[PDB]
Amino acid sequence: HTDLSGKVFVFPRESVTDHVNLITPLEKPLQNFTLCFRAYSDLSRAYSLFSYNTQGRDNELLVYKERVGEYSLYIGRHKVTSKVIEKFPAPVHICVSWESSSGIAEFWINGTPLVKKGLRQGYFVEAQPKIVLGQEQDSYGGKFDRSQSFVGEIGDLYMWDSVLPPENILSAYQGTPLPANILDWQALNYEIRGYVIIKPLVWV
């Protein structure tokens, strides 16, 4: 595992090929979770930000940006969509949390709460995943789509197994995130495939 503090993945071109595979020791199905990251991209079209897929289950947990100012979370095939006023193009902090008990999805865009939505209440998101940046999975770790590929910069990725409160969300955005127990940027297990470069984060 690597300390990626002050660095970002750069997905420098539109492709069916460039991705980073995120390795996790998660053997337990997910009930609660929070996911945080920082994105910079000037893509007009729809792209995937974070693709989490299990065997036989496509789109198990997916953060997808369908268009400017519109953020989508997919749990177990089902989706929710929340809107927001945002400048284009701009760097963005994104935190999404979901909760099996309440079904509640919680988007935070730059430490600002989006409208809460709800999906898949009681659903247990399956374990032993394949997580990928830069590409949207249609298979277990494969079947990428070019017109869905991410091009731009991603960093400060943290993933917890619990619903973070507003303070802790604001902590991540302000630059001091609680040590995360599923995916931790400062101790990250990644695999680069194709054209992706690690560079200093300068748009912060």
138 annotated to a ligand binding site:
yes
Binding of its own copies by 122 (CB under 8 A) = no
User: Alpha-carbon distance 31 to 125, whole Å?
Assistant: 7
Binding of its own copies by 187 (CB under 8 A) = no
Find the binder of Ca ion among 58, 70, 99, 161 (CB under 5 A). 58
Q: Which residues contact 133 (CB under 8 A, 6 or more apart)?
A: 9, 11, 19, 20, 22, 49, 50, 51, 150, 154, 157
User: Alpha-carbon distance 81 to 70, whole Å?
Assistant: 7
**Of these partners, its own copies, Ca ion, none, which one is at the site of residue 111 (CB under 5 to 8 Å by kind)?**
none
Using the contact rule CB under 8 A, the part of the chain among 29-37, 96-104, 125-133, 171-179 near its own copies is 96-104
Q: Which is nearer to Ca ion, 133 or 169 (CB)?
A: 133
Q: In a 3-state reduction of DSSP, which class is residue 146?
A: helix
In eight-state DSSP terms, residue 100 is T
Give, as ranges, the residues between 18 and 47 that touch its own copies (CB under 8 A). 40-42
Kindly list the residues in this chain that would bind its own copies in the complex (CB under 8 A). 10, 12-13, 40-42, 56, 58, 77, 80, 82-85, 87-90, 102-106, 113-119, 121, 138-139, 143, 151-153, 166, 195, 197, 199-200, 202-203
